[PDB]
Write a protein that binds this DNA or RNA. Structure first.
Ligand SMILES: [Mg+2]
Ligand SMILES: [Mg+2]
Ligand SMILES: [Zn+2]
Length: 607
DNA sequence: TACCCGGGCATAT
DNA sequence: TTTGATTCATAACCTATAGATATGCCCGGGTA
RNA sequence: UCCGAGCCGGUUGUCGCGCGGUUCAAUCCCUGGUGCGGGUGCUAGUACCGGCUCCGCACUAUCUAUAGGUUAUGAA
């Protein structure tokens, strides 16, 4: 449920023009940013230092103790036995780490709220990283060891001789995941490559469940997989493969958003005592520094401000909290329901139905029954958003200040070697002041805020153009193709699944549709035999490829060889078509057939 | 010796 | 479907996960 | 290492057409839109009334940190 919402506004409008209050928060967020940055490095340093004997069990108390030790040092006196025990163990390594990086204890007072926010956030990053990229990384390591890519290029594809290898590898995965118990003879028949992989996996001491696979164990107890995840990263570095960030590091020197609530407000901004704060209502207390009459603070859908914002010195994120919130202290069929097949009655009652074919270049390509075509290309989005313009300005500033040269020689932060990590800190410390000053410029934070405004305007203009073109009320049907997470090599990123959320915000229905073979059928003949693909060649469109002399095959242009679609006066011999146009026309036929009750056309049906 | 206040620390499921 | 032909660092664009404050107890320094 | 969108053709519901012609749209400064009135600012001929700009009435817009793939640059 949507129990919270956010309204992002500029720093100047959110806060009153009182200079004292603005300066105090700017200093406060900078201190918290420095504490958060060093805490992540200190946590990694502690793990690497103690990795010589055994991997420690990282908990919430571990990160909280590190934050207090960096701030107050030995001056921190926890009252709980559990926190006191962690303080004693982490104390010898915190002071040594500070000497290496030249860290100076800030001794910030009233840090209780900030430390709790940072401790939970860092623990969140640890859990999320383990859940998402443990099974993926473990299977990735297995493929690299067997050299699947090498065998694919050298061995003949689609042959029964190599299908056995795929079956052999597929069966080994169940043994690796402990889903199927291997036999004694099966272990003996393993090749030295297979035997070595099995021994290495068993060395990770992976948890086991009597009646559930390894994937279920990861969801149930993600934290227990952390010692194995760190050891897996060491195996990647040992064999020279591309390493991965096992431990999240907040290496960014750009001013990050810091959570500010009512307690932080009176302690650091207003600088009033807690006794005086309790005598003033929350709304009256916030009005002294923040203009609650601003449009960003207006209540929406029954949610209220409730005093919770995050700011980075240029943009202020005003959060709206529902009265029924938790007050702190704490699927396959559902996805199928988003498809147009289960949402047919909604389309019938719609004033107009618009089909969209997502593509890498033509992100949105719209067409309706009336034939009014509309498209939202990536070039149009980039110009309106200004990401390309911002990137050039950011690149120019780095070249002028020489920051790119300094950053290029920074060692890998993903390494597990203690000496290499120590060298990484020394190199980072060598020019830390130069990079900190460069990223302290307001442009870096301003670019984030300007991109948000440009993206919001681009989305608003896109909705307005579609409404003018197709009508005030319409229903959008989009192809199910989505390059989510995984992106093809040599191809830029593209927004695929985010359009579903955008249409939901604008109260516009968005229904998925299968794109299987929707670009290989000619609508005029409903045949796929005569469709021609990549028939013509031309010099590569990318400027660096064109200078090299590469030749690309056209993918967006297709033709139909059916004589019925042709005319006697034609000399080309084929009826040319646009790939985006073909998909939208095919989607219209599919949607119309489904609405009429005939279902998906048999030509577009899967095998 | 005893009381007050500001701040440090703990915890909610 | 889609559109193209090995390692590290810094920004971004995208996708996904998790979390998005307040009340009470005590203790030490100062004052009566 | 580069790019806006619309329309007319070569063209025929065709291009990463560095194909030809035409219109406005954005490069600094800006949280965005929607429905009402006013205040007069600009737009059209004698209340007809459409459009841009502010005023304020209320409905709506989910952000932060991290991880992964990719992109741009700097090093191999
Ligand atoms: Mg598509
Ligand atoms: Mg397409
Ligand atoms: Zn045909």
């Amino acid at each position: 449920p949507t129990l919270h919402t956010c309204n992002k506004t500029s720093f100047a409008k959110a806060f009153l023009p009182n200079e004292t209050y603005r300066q105090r928060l700017l200093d406060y967020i900078a201190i918290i940013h420095q504490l958060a940055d060093h805490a992540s490095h200190a946590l990694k340093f502690y793990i690497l230092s103690t990795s010589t004997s055994s991997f420690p069990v990282v908990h919430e108390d571990t990160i909280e103790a590190i934050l207090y030790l960096l701030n107050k040092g030995e001056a921190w006196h926890p009252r709980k036995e559990a926190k006191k025990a962690w303080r004693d163990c982490l104390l010898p390594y915190v002071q040594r780490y500070c000497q290496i990086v030249g860290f100076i204890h800030p001794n910030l007072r009233g840090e209780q709220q900030s430390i709790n926010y940072l401790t939970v956030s860092m623990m969140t990053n640890l859990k999320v990283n383990v859940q998402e990229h443990f099974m993926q990384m473990l299977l990735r390591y297995i493929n690299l060891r067997f050299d699947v890519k090498g065998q694919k290029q050298r061995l003949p594809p689609k042959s029964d001789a190599r299908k056995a290898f795929f079956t052999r590898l597929r069966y080994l995965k169940s043994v690796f995941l402990f889903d199927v118990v291997p036999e004694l003879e099966f272990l003996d028949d393993l090749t030295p490559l297979e035997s070595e992989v099995l021994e290495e996996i068993w060395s990770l001491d992976l948890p086991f469940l009597p009646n559930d696979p390894l994937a279920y164990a990861i969801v149930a107890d993600p934290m227990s997989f952390f010692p194995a995840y760190c050891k897996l990263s060491g195996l990647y570095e040992q064999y020279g493969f591309q390493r991965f960030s096992a431990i999240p590091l907040r290496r960014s020197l750009i001013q990050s958003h810091v959570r500010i609530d009512t307690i932080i407000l009176y302690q650091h901004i207003l600088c009033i005592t807690r006794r005086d704060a309790e005598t003033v209502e929350k709304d009256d207390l916030w009005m002294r520094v923040c203009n609650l009459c601003t449009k960003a603070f207006r209540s929406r859908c029954g949610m209220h401000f409730e005093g919770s914002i995050t700011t980075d010195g240029a943009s202020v994120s005003v959060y709206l909290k529902h009265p029924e919130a938790d007050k702190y202290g704490k699927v396959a069929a559902e996805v199928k329901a988003l498809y147009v097949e289960n949402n047919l009655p909604a389309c019938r009652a719609a004033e107009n139905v618009v089909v969209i074919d997502p593509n890498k270049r033509d992100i949105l390509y719209c067409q309706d029954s009336n034939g009014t075509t509309f498209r939202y290309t990536a070039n149009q989005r980039a110009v309106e958003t200004g990401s390309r313009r911002f990137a050039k300005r950011r690149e120019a500033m780095k070249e002028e200040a020489g920051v790119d040269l300094i950053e290029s020689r920074i060692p890998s932060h993903k390494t597990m070697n203690l000496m290499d990590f120590t060298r990484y800190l020394l190199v980072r410390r060598a020019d830390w002041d130069r990079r900190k000053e460069f990223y302290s410029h307001p442009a870096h934070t301003r670019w984030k805020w300007h991109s948000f405004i440009n993206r919001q305007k681009s989305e608003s203009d896109l909705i307005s153009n579609m409404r003018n073109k197709y009508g005030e009320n319409f229903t959008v049907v989009m192809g199910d193709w989505s390059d989510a997470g995984r992106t093809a090599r040599f191809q830029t990123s593209s927004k695929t699944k985010g359009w579903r959320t955008l249409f939901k915000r604008n109260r516009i229905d968005c229904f998925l549709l299968d794109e299987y073979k929707t670009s290989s059928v000619c609508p005029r003949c409903s045949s796929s035999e005569f469709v021609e693909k990549k028939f013509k060649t031309r010099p590569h469109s990318r400027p660096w490829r064109r200078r090299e002399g590469k030749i690309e095959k056209v993918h967006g242009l297709l033709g139909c060889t059916n004589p019925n679609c042709l005319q006697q006066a034609w000399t080309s011999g084929m009826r040319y078509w646009n790939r985006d146009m073909l998909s939208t026309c095919n989607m219209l036929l599919i949607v119309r057939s489904m609405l009429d009750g005939h279902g998906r056309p048999e030509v577009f049906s899967r095998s």
